[PDB]
Amino acid sequence: TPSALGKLQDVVNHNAQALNTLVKQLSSKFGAISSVLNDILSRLDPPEAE
Amino acid sequence: NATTFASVYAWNRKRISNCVADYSVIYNFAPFFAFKCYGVSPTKLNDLCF
Ligand SMILES: *[C@@H]1O[C@H](CO)[C@@H](O)[C@H](O)[C@H]1NC(C)=O
């Protein structure tokens, strides 16, 4: 059968899919000049980078 | 040091590439009037790239 174990497949997929979205949003720059903390620290001063 | 600057409605736009951006050669012309940077810091322009 192609998908008789779909329940276990749905379980192992929902965990990885939600976890990959968390890594995806790590590269998302929330209204900032850069998403990498090393890029903002290398471009702005502490009073402006905050 | 072009000795000739264009008007405000026909402003020039020089493109710079393939060279080391040594900004230390700027602070030997004369005491400036304004250096209000935006998006970056006037101090950390050395180690950055463009
Ligand atoms: C600008 O150019 C002139 C020659 O055209 C030179 O005498 C002068 O030193 C230059 N200015 C600077 C800041 O080097």
Side-chain angles (χ1 to χ4, degrees), chain B residues 1 3 28-29:
Chain B
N1 204 17
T3 69
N28 59 267
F29 282 83

Side-chain angles (χ1 to χ4, degrees), chain A residues 33 41-44, chain B residues 39-41 44 48:
Chain A
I33 61 178
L41 194 271
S42 59
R43 292 172 52 182
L44 298 180
Chain B
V40 289
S41 62
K44 308 189 66 60
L48 287 178

Side-chain angles (χ1 to χ4, degrees), chain A residues 9-36:
Chain A
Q9 184 67 22
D10 293 330
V11 168
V12 303
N13 285 19
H14 291 180
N15 298 135
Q17 186 176 192
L19 197 150
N20 292 329
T21 313
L22 190 67
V23 188
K24 176 66 62 179
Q25 297 186 186
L26 197 274
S27 61
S28 178
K29 42 180 179 60
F30 300 89
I33 61 178
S34 298
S35 61
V36 180

